[PDB]
Amino acid sequence: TNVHNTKLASTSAENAIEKEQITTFHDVETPNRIDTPMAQDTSSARSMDDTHSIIQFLQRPVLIDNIEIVAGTTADNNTALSRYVLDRTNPQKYIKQWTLPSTVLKAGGKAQKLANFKYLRCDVQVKIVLNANPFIAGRLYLAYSPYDDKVAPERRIIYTSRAGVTGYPGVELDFQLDNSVEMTIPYASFQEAYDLVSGNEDFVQLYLFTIAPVLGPSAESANSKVDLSVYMWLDNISLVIPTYRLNPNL
Amino acid sequence: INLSNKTDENTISFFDSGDPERMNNEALMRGCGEQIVNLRPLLRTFRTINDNWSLAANTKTPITDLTNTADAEGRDYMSYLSFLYRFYRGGRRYKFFNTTPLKQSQTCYVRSFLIPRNYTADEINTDGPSHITYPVINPVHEVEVPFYSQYRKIPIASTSDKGYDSSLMYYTNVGTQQIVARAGNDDFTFGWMIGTPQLQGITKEVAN
Amino acid sequence: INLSNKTDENTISFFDSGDPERMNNEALMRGCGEQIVNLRPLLRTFRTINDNWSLAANTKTPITDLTNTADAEGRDYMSYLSFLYRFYRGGRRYKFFNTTPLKQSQTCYVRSFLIPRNYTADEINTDGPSHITYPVINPVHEVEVPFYSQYRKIPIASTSDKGYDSSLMYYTNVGTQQIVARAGNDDFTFGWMIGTPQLQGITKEVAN
Amino acid sequence: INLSNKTDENTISFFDSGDPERMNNEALMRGCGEQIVNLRPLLRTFRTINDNWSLAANTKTPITDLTNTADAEGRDYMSYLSFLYRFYRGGRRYKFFNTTPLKQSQTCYVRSFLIPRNYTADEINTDGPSHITYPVINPVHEVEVPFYSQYRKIPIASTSDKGYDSSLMYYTNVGTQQIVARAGNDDFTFGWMIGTPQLQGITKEVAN
């Protein structure tokens, strides 16, 4: 019976059901396996680092945008937040807008790991690292508006006042006080999970407004400016249901 | 391998999911507010079988006139759920909401009597327990019919015997229109289960 | 009878014989005097791979020159037993018995260095640990090569990388002939088992 | 269903009947008065093999003359039951009832001797134990033959040896007729069981 390096053909139990992760094999009899006798782990990968999961991979910060606002510019990035908005041809100006959670699913190789999965529940974590020499001042407001693209215009963070914009959930971002701000955007869908295949829908828009423009010396200079870098990742993740389909958008 | 055609009765449930009872409850506490567990409650609800049933004046009209039509349609619960069963028992409830558009007499009144099923008004007396309403002060009749039967279960089929269970007569001294809603009493239930029929959906008359 | 193709795993041993271990021992105590139970001992024995390996004077000769030839032949244990396995580990031992028939210089000396495997003498320095012998007083070199590897197991196959384990250089100031016997150190062993190749037997060139 | 041809060894007895032993006994106590349970008792009963066996005067007649004929017929128990078996043992009993119609001598006597089976009267002496009767005072002989054998069982078949068991000689000084009834002694029994032969029934010679 006791032979090495081969498994001979034999009968076995007449009703076998082996369940791998999601595939379940039924066989008429128990398969005739050959495994390695007294197996070992002859590698060092488990000693180099820990094996990261998909939840860990999706928790990795990804650089989304790098902005550079210059002082003395009548551009939408430097022009400030307006007291009133009387018409839609004259809305509130913003530095950068982000459709979420798409902007993260389509970044850092996260779509490769979200592939072959149907439903998702996740919070979006945002970190902005700003840098401005001690002679530059200013103040930004990072706020998020849910369903801003799908909600009526009167209900949008765009097309409302400064006191309305700053009534939204956000972080005050001063150049000389808050060199860095963080923000957690919760799971914003009205449905039980994000559909990663059928519905390419976004549910929360992230806006970076300007309370006070870049205040620098009167003398024109290339140095009167600030540089931004926005990082994003996911948190409180749940990928559950497999699927053979993919979103070609991602 | 043994030459055999057998059944091992293998069952597989997917997805590594939680308890369906708990999740279903969580869902109903957020999107329904109730949990229907049985279909007799639907025999207690009142549903319309005709939203306009016109009648003639001084005419005793057996409601079989209408329920023989309604039972085949499948519009109300007492008809839709009757295609799953063969027997029934218990009494029935009928509500008649007045929708009479014209005034015929100074005093309009609605009156209801008993009648054996499948009888005609010319075969029965206007005696026994009755109920009278005045649509001007009370535009809803709300009569009930008990199970006055020779048998403990009534078949939804035809029979040799006749007049073996009670039904309703409806009298109006004037030509009235009615919303007719019906239901079963607190004892009505259907028999023992059978298969479903086909269902009729949308009809699209297209030019050829 | 059941229509079936099965295996009952029946085993039969003939002859009503005694214990094979006891009888084998009795036999070895009369006709062998020893009992080989493992093939690593054969990797410890020294066996010839070339009974004459001529060299040129003032030439650093990597012994791969010879072992690449020898490993394919199957003449020594380190080659015959390598066709059963895929991996190996540990160092190696080489003995060089002098068979030089002519006198070239008053003082003949043999010297050995290290060298990464599959390197050439023009790609490596003559530094590091060495061993020197004088064939006139000591006609046997008896050098040993440690396992100086980047990997815990070396495949008998080819690789992308090169110089990942150590080997031997052989230098003679004069043209010498050698009986080259090799073996493994007290740590050498082969990998994990595979099938056998064909064997080559007698060749009879016959006139047709 | 499994492809198989098997035996489940299922047995069914009909009729919800009582105990066969009790009912059989009840029946025998009303219609038989006895219960035959074995066939040796039938080897103890005396039955006729010839109801007239004529003999010549002053002639020693071995009874094989008659039993070789009788054993093939199947008329007596010792012959009918011999077709179920192959061996026999034990002695035999013979009764000779006189039916001689004529008077030959003033004094008629019957005498019986022993003789090895298949011998002739010219091959044996008239010595040994004998028995003599006088049919006028005793018309029944009632001799018995012991099992004087070289073998513990005698085959109903033929043999190479001869005279290996005893038999009977029969002598009459006058021509007598006899009813010949035979049986086995209290030790006679047949051998071990085999199959039955065919039976011969009625013969109807019809004119064609």
PDB file of C-alpha atoms in Angstrom, chain A residues 20-250:
ATOM      1  CA  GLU A  20     -12.893  25.317  -2.224  1.00  0.00           C
ATOM      2  CA  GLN A  21     -13.433  29.019  -1.623  1.00  0.00           C
ATOM      3  CA  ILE A  22     -16.548  29.458  -3.761  1.00  0.00           C
ATOM      4  CA  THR A  23     -16.476  26.474  -6.130  1.00  0.00           C
ATOM      5  CA  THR A  24     -17.963  23.240  -4.797  1.00  0.00           C
ATOM      6  CA  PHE A  25     -17.001  19.992  -6.503  1.00  0.00           C
ATOM      7  CA  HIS A  26     -19.232  16.958  -6.257  1.00  0.00           C
ATOM      8  CA  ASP A  27     -17.483  13.751  -7.284  1.00  0.00           C
ATOM      9  CA  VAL A  28     -18.818  10.216  -7.533  1.00  0.00           C
ATOM     10  CA  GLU A  29     -15.962   9.023  -5.328  1.00  0.00           C
ATOM     11  CA  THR A  30     -13.322  10.785  -3.294  1.00  0.00           C
ATOM     12  CA  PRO A  31     -10.565  12.009  -5.643  1.00  0.00           C
ATOM     13  CA  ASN A  32      -7.254  10.168  -5.528  1.00  0.00           C
ATOM     14  CA  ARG A  33      -4.893  12.888  -4.370  1.00  0.00           C
ATOM     15  CA  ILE A  34      -1.125  12.915  -4.233  1.00  0.00           C
ATOM     16  CA  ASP A  35       0.248  15.458  -1.799  1.00  0.00           C
ATOM     17  CA  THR A  36       3.816  16.125  -0.780  1.00  0.00           C
ATOM     18  CA  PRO A  37       4.928  13.964   2.178  1.00  0.00           C
ATOM     19  CA  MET A  38       6.092  15.998   5.178  1.00  0.00           C
ATOM     20  CA  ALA A  39       5.782  19.257   3.297  1.00  0.00           C
ATOM     21  CA  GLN A  40       7.711  22.410   4.154  1.00  0.00           C
ATOM     22  CA  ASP A  41       7.664  26.113   3.344  1.00  0.00           C
ATOM     23  CA  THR A  42      10.959  26.506   1.487  1.00  0.00           C
ATOM     24  CA  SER A  43      10.482  30.245   0.928  1.00  0.00           C
ATOM     25  CA  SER A  44      11.102  33.377   2.981  1.00  0.00           C
ATOM     26  CA  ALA A  45       8.108  35.466   1.909  1.00  0.00           C
ATOM     27  CA  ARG A  46       6.361  35.029   5.264  1.00  0.00           C
ATOM     28  CA  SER A  47       9.487  36.451   6.922  1.00  0.00           C
ATOM     29  CA  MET A  48       9.812  39.525   4.687  1.00  0.00           C
ATOM     30  CA  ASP A  49       6.420  41.141   5.310  1.00  0.00           C
ATOM     31  CA  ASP A  50       2.801  40.351   6.072  1.00  0.00           C
ATOM     32  CA  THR A  51       0.450  39.211   3.328  1.00  0.00           C
ATOM     33  CA  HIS A  52      -1.901  42.115   2.725  1.00  0.00           C
ATOM     34  CA  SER A  53      -5.591  41.624   2.039  1.00  0.00           C
ATOM     35  CA  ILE A  54      -7.841  43.462  -0.387  1.00  0.00           C
ATOM     36  CA  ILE A  55      -9.172  45.555   2.494  1.00  0.00           C
ATOM     37  CA  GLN A  56      -5.588  46.517   3.307  1.00  0.00           C
ATOM     38  CA  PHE A  57      -4.754  47.230  -0.331  1.00  0.00           C
ATOM     39  CA  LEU A  58      -7.772  49.529  -0.624  1.00  0.00           C
ATOM     40  CA  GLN A  59      -6.658  51.321   2.555  1.00  0.00           C
ATOM     41  CA  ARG A  60      -3.474  52.498   0.853  1.00  0.00           C
ATOM     42  CA  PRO A  61      -3.261  56.269   0.287  1.00  0.00           C
ATOM     43  CA  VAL A  62      -3.148  57.262  -3.376  1.00  0.00           C
ATOM     44  CA  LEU A  63      -2.063  60.641  -4.705  1.00  0.00           C
ATOM     45  CA  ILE A  64      -5.063  61.955  -6.632  1.00  0.00           C
ATOM     46  CA  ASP A  65      -4.161  65.563  -7.438  1.00  0.00           C
ATOM     47  CA  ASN A  66      -1.404  68.132  -6.984  1.00  0.00           C
ATOM     48  CA  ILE A  67      -2.625  71.731  -7.112  1.00  0.00           C
ATOM     49  CA  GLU A  68      -0.568  74.924  -7.174  1.00  0.00           C
ATOM     50  CA  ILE A  69      -2.398  78.172  -6.417  1.00  0.00           C
ATOM     51  CA  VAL A  70      -0.529  81.372  -7.272  1.00  0.00           C
ATOM     52  CA  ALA A  71      -1.282  84.736  -5.710  1.00  0.00           C
ATOM     53  CA  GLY A  72      -2.554  87.635  -7.771  1.00  0.00           C
ATOM     54  CA  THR A  73      -4.584  85.473 -10.134  1.00  0.00           C
ATOM     55  CA  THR A  74      -8.237  85.928 -11.060  1.00  0.00           C
ATOM     56  CA  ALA A  75      -8.619  82.201 -11.625  1.00  0.00           C
ATOM     57  CA  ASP A  76     -11.256  79.928 -10.165  1.00  0.00           C
ATOM     58  CA  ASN A  77      -8.653  78.377  -7.863  1.00  0.00           C
ATOM     59  CA  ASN A  78      -7.695  81.687  -6.212  1.00  0.00           C
ATOM     60  CA  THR A  79     -10.925  83.676  -6.496  1.00  0.00           C
ATOM     61  CA  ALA A  80     -12.708  83.473  -3.189  1.00  0.00           C
ATOM     62  CA  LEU A  81     -16.043  82.166  -1.958  1.00  0.00           C
ATOM     63  CA  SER A  82     -18.890  84.540  -2.752  1.00  0.00           C
ATOM     64  CA  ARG A  83     -21.346  85.933  -0.214  1.00  0.00           C
ATOM     65  CA  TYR A  84     -24.335  85.447  -2.518  1.00  0.00           C
ATOM     66  CA  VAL A  85     -25.209  83.479  -5.635  1.00  0.00           C
ATOM     67  CA  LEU A  86     -28.087  85.112  -7.487  1.00  0.00           C
ATOM     68  CA  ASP A  87     -27.791  83.209 -10.773  1.00  0.00           C
ATOM     69  CA  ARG A  88     -26.352  79.946 -12.062  1.00  0.00           C
ATOM     70  CA  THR A  89     -24.166  81.735 -14.620  1.00  0.00           C
ATOM     71  CA  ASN A  90     -22.344  83.106 -11.551  1.00  0.00           C
ATOM     72  CA  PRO A  91     -21.857  80.130  -9.215  1.00  0.00           C
ATOM     73  CA  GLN A  92     -19.352  79.493  -6.459  1.00  0.00           C
ATOM     74  CA  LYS A  93     -15.798  78.906  -7.627  1.00  0.00           C
ATOM     75  CA  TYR A  94     -13.755  75.961  -6.402  1.00  0.00           C
ATOM     76  CA  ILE A  95     -10.166  74.805  -6.684  1.00  0.00           C
ATOM     77  CA  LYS A  96     -10.862  71.163  -7.526  1.00  0.00           C
ATOM     78  CA  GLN A  97     -13.830  68.798  -7.502  1.00  0.00           C
ATOM     79  CA  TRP A  98     -13.831  65.033  -7.001  1.00  0.00           C
ATOM     80  CA  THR A  99     -16.534  62.524  -7.851  1.00  0.00           C
ATOM     81  CA  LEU A 100     -16.582  59.911  -5.125  1.00  0.00           C
ATOM     82  CA  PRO A 101     -16.001  57.094  -4.684  1.00  0.00           C
ATOM     83  CA  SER A 102     -15.054  56.743  -8.375  1.00  0.00           C
ATOM     84  CA  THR A 103     -11.939  58.912  -8.094  1.00  0.00           C
ATOM     85  CA  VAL A 104     -10.547  56.312  -5.672  1.00  0.00           C
ATOM     86  CA  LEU A 105     -11.823  53.140  -7.339  1.00  0.00           C
ATOM     87  CA  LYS A 106     -10.056  54.385 -10.499  1.00  0.00           C
ATOM     88  CA  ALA A 107      -6.755  55.039  -8.739  1.00  0.00           C
ATOM     89  CA  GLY A 108      -3.766  53.228  -7.303  1.00  0.00           C
ATOM     90  CA  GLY A 109      -4.606  49.906  -8.908  1.00  0.00           C
ATOM     91  CA  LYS A 110      -7.706  49.516  -6.756  1.00  0.00           C
ATOM     92  CA  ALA A 111      -9.925  48.587  -9.697  1.00  0.00           C
ATOM     93  CA  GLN A 112      -7.719  45.530 -10.190  1.00  0.00           C
ATOM     94  CA  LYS A 113      -8.672  44.312  -6.708  1.00  0.00           C
ATOM     95  CA  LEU A 114     -12.314  45.408  -6.864  1.00  0.00           C
ATOM     96  CA  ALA A 115     -12.685  43.470 -10.113  1.00  0.00           C
ATOM     97  CA  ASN A 116     -14.823  40.326 -10.038  1.00  0.00           C
ATOM     98  CA  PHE A 117     -16.856  41.728  -7.155  1.00  0.00           C
ATOM     99  CA  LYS A 118     -20.396  43.059  -7.354  1.00  0.00           C
ATOM    100  CA  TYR A 119     -21.145  45.023  -4.164  1.00  0.00           C
ATOM    101  CA  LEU A 120     -19.117  47.404  -2.001  1.00  0.00           C
ATOM    102  CA  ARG A 121     -19.558  49.401   1.199  1.00  0.00           C
ATOM    103  CA  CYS A 122     -16.763  51.811   2.031  1.00  0.00           C
ATOM    104  CA  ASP A 123     -15.954  55.133   3.618  1.00  0.00           C
ATOM    105  CA  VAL A 124     -13.542  57.475   1.837  1.00  0.00           C
ATOM    106  CA  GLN A 125     -10.650  58.909   3.828  1.00  0.00           C
ATOM    107  CA  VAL A 126      -9.101  62.139   2.500  1.00  0.00           C
ATOM    108  CA  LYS A 127      -5.820  63.774   3.504  1.00  0.00           C
ATOM    109  CA  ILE A 128      -4.496  67.051   2.089  1.00  0.00           C
ATOM    110  CA  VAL A 129      -0.890  68.099   2.745  1.00  0.00           C
ATOM    111  CA  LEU A 130      -0.450  71.803   2.034  1.00  0.00           C
ATOM    112  CA  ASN A 131       2.847  73.672   2.136  1.00  0.00           C
ATOM    113  CA  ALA A 132       3.285  77.443   2.165  1.00  0.00           C
ATOM    114  CA  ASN A 133       6.283  79.416   3.355  1.00  0.00           C
ATOM    115  CA  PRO A 134       5.805  81.448   6.550  1.00  0.00           C
ATOM    116  CA  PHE A 135       5.216  84.614   4.494  1.00  0.00           C
ATOM    117  CA  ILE A 136       2.074  83.370   2.702  1.00  0.00           C
ATOM    118  CA  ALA A 137      -1.383  83.339   4.262  1.00  0.00           C
ATOM    119  CA  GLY A 138      -4.788  82.094   3.232  1.00  0.00           C
ATOM    120  CA  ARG A 139      -7.659  79.840   4.148  1.00  0.00           C
ATOM    121  CA  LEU A 140      -9.459  77.058   2.292  1.00  0.00           C
ATOM    122  CA  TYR A 141     -12.567  75.036   3.111  1.00  0.00           C
ATOM    123  CA  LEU A 142     -12.771  71.361   2.182  1.00  0.00           C
ATOM    124  CA  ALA A 143     -16.410  70.270   2.089  1.00  0.00           C
ATOM    125  CA  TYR A 144     -18.381  67.384   0.620  1.00  0.00           C
ATOM    126  CA  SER A 145     -21.875  67.576  -0.858  1.00  0.00           C
ATOM    127  CA  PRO A 146     -23.871  64.348  -1.273  1.00  0.00           C
ATOM    128  CA  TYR A 147     -25.834  63.889  -4.491  1.00  0.00           C
ATOM    129  CA  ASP A 148     -24.688  67.344  -5.590  1.00  0.00           C
ATOM    130  CA  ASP A 149     -24.737  66.250  -9.233  1.00  0.00           C
ATOM    131  CA  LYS A 150     -28.115  64.509  -8.889  1.00  0.00           C
ATOM    132  CA  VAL A 151     -29.926  66.894  -6.527  1.00  0.00           C
ATOM    133  CA  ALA A 152     -31.906  69.924  -7.679  1.00  0.00           C
ATOM    134  CA  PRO A 153     -29.758  73.021  -8.299  1.00  0.00           C
ATOM    135  CA  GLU A 154     -31.153  75.054  -5.403  1.00  0.00           C
ATOM    136  CA  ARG A 155     -29.989  72.217  -3.125  1.00  0.00           C
ATOM    137  CA  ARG A 156     -26.390  72.163  -4.385  1.00  0.00           C
ATOM    138  CA  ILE A 157     -23.305  73.415  -2.570  1.00  0.00           C
ATOM    139  CA  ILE A 158     -22.683  75.121  -5.863  1.00  0.00           C
ATOM    140  CA  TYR A 159     -25.445  77.710  -6.316  1.00  0.00           C
ATOM    141  CA  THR A 160     -25.607  78.593  -2.604  1.00  0.00           C
ATOM    142  CA  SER A 161     -24.043  81.225  -0.387  1.00  0.00           C
ATOM    143  CA  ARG A 162     -20.805  81.350   1.561  1.00  0.00           C
ATOM    144  CA  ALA A 163     -22.768  80.823   4.768  1.00  0.00           C
ATOM    145  CA  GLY A 164     -24.471  77.885   3.073  1.00  0.00           C
ATOM    146  CA  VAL A 165     -21.270  76.376   1.733  1.00  0.00           C
ATOM    147  CA  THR A 166     -19.617  76.677   5.139  1.00  0.00           C
ATOM    148  CA  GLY A 167     -22.701  75.071   6.643  1.00  0.00           C
ATOM    149  CA  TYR A 168     -21.738  71.846   4.918  1.00  0.00           C
ATOM    150  CA  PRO A 169     -19.544  69.219   6.599  1.00  0.00           C
ATOM    151  CA  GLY A 170     -15.983  70.345   6.051  1.00  0.00           C
ATOM    152  CA  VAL A 171     -12.599  71.273   7.451  1.00  0.00           C
ATOM    153  CA  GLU A 172     -11.142  74.760   7.743  1.00  0.00           C
ATOM    154  CA  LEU A 173      -7.655  74.705   6.218  1.00  0.00           C
ATOM    155  CA  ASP A 174      -5.362  77.611   7.087  1.00  0.00           C
ATOM    156  CA  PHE A 175      -1.887  77.779   5.605  1.00  0.00           C
ATOM    157  CA  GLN A 176      -0.057  78.718   8.814  1.00  0.00           C
ATOM    158  CA  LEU A 177      -2.250  76.808  11.295  1.00  0.00           C
ATOM    159  CA  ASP A 178      -3.417  73.642   9.498  1.00  0.00           C
ATOM    160  CA  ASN A 179      -0.640  72.501   7.181  1.00  0.00           C
ATOM    161  CA  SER A 180      -2.654  69.284   6.787  1.00  0.00           C
ATOM    162  CA  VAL A 181      -6.288  68.257   7.165  1.00  0.00           C
ATOM    163  CA  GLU A 182      -8.051  64.907   7.199  1.00  0.00           C
ATOM    164  CA  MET A 183     -11.630  64.015   6.372  1.00  0.00           C
ATOM    165  CA  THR A 184     -13.809  60.911   6.565  1.00  0.00           C
ATOM    166  CA  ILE A 185     -16.679  60.797   4.086  1.00  0.00           C
ATOM    167  CA  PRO A 186     -19.146  58.081   5.142  1.00  0.00           C
ATOM    168  CA  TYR A 187     -20.857  55.550   2.925  1.00  0.00           C
ATOM    169  CA  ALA A 188     -23.176  57.921   1.062  1.00  0.00           C
ATOM    170  CA  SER A 189     -25.382  55.554  -0.921  1.00  0.00           C
ATOM    171  CA  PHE A 190     -29.076  55.252  -0.167  1.00  0.00           C
ATOM    172  CA  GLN A 191     -28.909  51.576  -1.153  1.00  0.00           C
ATOM    173  CA  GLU A 192     -27.427  48.660   0.712  1.00  0.00           C
ATOM    174  CA  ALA A 193     -24.117  48.703  -1.178  1.00  0.00           C
ATOM    175  CA  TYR A 194     -22.296  50.263  -4.095  1.00  0.00           C
ATOM    176  CA  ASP A 195     -22.905  48.362  -7.335  1.00  0.00           C
ATOM    177  CA  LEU A 196     -19.481  48.028  -8.968  1.00  0.00           C
ATOM    178  CA  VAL A 197     -20.774  46.573 -12.260  1.00  0.00           C
ATOM    179  CA  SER A 198     -24.163  47.953 -13.265  1.00  0.00           C
ATOM    180  CA  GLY A 199     -24.437  51.312 -11.542  1.00  0.00           C
ATOM    181  CA  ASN A 200     -21.491  53.594 -12.246  1.00  0.00           C
ATOM    182  CA  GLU A 201     -23.062  56.142  -9.923  1.00  0.00           C
ATOM    183  CA  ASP A 202     -21.393  58.671  -7.654  1.00  0.00           C
ATOM    184  CA  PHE A 203     -23.078  59.774  -4.453  1.00  0.00           C
ATOM    185  CA  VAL A 204     -20.842  62.392  -2.804  1.00  0.00           C
ATOM    186  CA  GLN A 205     -18.891  65.257  -4.360  1.00  0.00           C
ATOM    187  CA  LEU A 206     -15.848  66.688  -2.596  1.00  0.00           C
ATOM    188  CA  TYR A 207     -15.144  70.395  -3.052  1.00  0.00           C
ATOM    189  CA  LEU A 208     -12.133  72.519  -2.108  1.00  0.00           C
ATOM    190  CA  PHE A 209     -13.256  76.123  -1.735  1.00  0.00           C
ATOM    191  CA  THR A 210     -11.375  79.345  -1.011  1.00  0.00           C
ATOM    192  CA  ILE A 211     -12.367  81.508   1.950  1.00  0.00           C
ATOM    193  CA  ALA A 212      -9.430  83.906   1.672  1.00  0.00           C
ATOM    194  CA  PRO A 213      -7.185  83.946  -1.420  1.00  0.00           C
ATOM    195  CA  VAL A 214      -3.430  83.579  -1.207  1.00  0.00           C
ATOM    196  CA  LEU A 215      -2.219  86.692   0.610  1.00  0.00           C
ATOM    197  CA  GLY A 216       1.351  87.468  -0.364  1.00  0.00           C
ATOM    198  CA  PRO A 217       3.652  90.437  -0.865  1.00  0.00           C
ATOM    199  CA  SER A 218       2.554  93.235  -3.167  1.00  0.00           C
ATOM    200  CA  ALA A 219       5.720  92.754  -5.220  1.00  0.00           C
ATOM    201  CA  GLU A 220       5.047  90.191  -7.935  1.00  0.00           C
ATOM    202  CA  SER A 221       7.047  87.030  -7.321  1.00  0.00           C
ATOM    203  CA  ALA A 222       6.977  83.393  -8.367  1.00  0.00           C
ATOM    204  CA  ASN A 223       7.331  82.470  -4.686  1.00  0.00           C
ATOM    205  CA  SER A 224       3.956  83.838  -3.532  1.00  0.00           C
ATOM    206  CA  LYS A 225       2.079  80.581  -4.007  1.00  0.00           C
ATOM    207  CA  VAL A 226       1.074  77.349  -2.314  1.00  0.00           C
ATOM    208  CA  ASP A 227       1.302  73.726  -3.421  1.00  0.00           C
ATOM    209  CA  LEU A 228      -1.284  71.099  -2.517  1.00  0.00           C
ATOM    210  CA  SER A 229      -1.376  67.324  -2.721  1.00  0.00           C
ATOM    211  CA  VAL A 230      -4.544  65.313  -2.120  1.00  0.00           C
ATOM    212  CA  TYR A 231      -4.428  61.723  -0.886  1.00  0.00           C
ATOM    213  CA  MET A 232      -7.372  59.334  -0.848  1.00  0.00           C
ATOM    214  CA  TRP A 233      -8.120  55.829   0.355  1.00  0.00           C
ATOM    215  CA  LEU A 234     -11.022  53.711   1.562  1.00  0.00           C
ATOM    216  CA  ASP A 235     -12.063  52.555   5.017  1.00  0.00           C
ATOM    217  CA  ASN A 236     -14.700  50.252   6.525  1.00  0.00           C
ATOM    218  CA  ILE A 237     -14.690  48.026   3.462  1.00  0.00           C
ATOM    219  CA  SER A 238     -16.844  45.065   2.476  1.00  0.00           C
ATOM    220  CA  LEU A 239     -16.484  43.197  -0.837  1.00  0.00           C
ATOM    221  CA  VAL A 240     -18.857  40.246  -0.760  1.00  0.00           C
ATOM    222  CA  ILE A 241     -20.464  38.821  -3.906  1.00  0.00           C
ATOM    223  CA  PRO A 242     -18.326  37.563  -6.823  1.00  0.00           C
ATOM    224  CA  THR A 243     -19.178  38.042 -10.479  1.00  0.00           C
ATOM    225  CA  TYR A 244     -17.631  37.532 -13.900  1.00  0.00           C
ATOM    226  CA  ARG A 245     -18.536  41.045 -15.053  1.00  0.00           C
ATOM    227  CA  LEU A 246     -16.412  44.179 -14.966  1.00  0.00           C
ATOM    228  CA  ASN A 247     -16.966  47.906 -15.291  1.00  0.00           C
ATOM    229  CA  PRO A 248     -14.936  49.010 -18.351  1.00  0.00           C
ATOM    230  CA  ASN A 249     -14.910  52.515 -16.846  1.00  0.00           C
ATOM    231  CA  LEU A 250     -12.404  51.414 -14.195  1.00  0.00           C
TER     232      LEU A 250
END
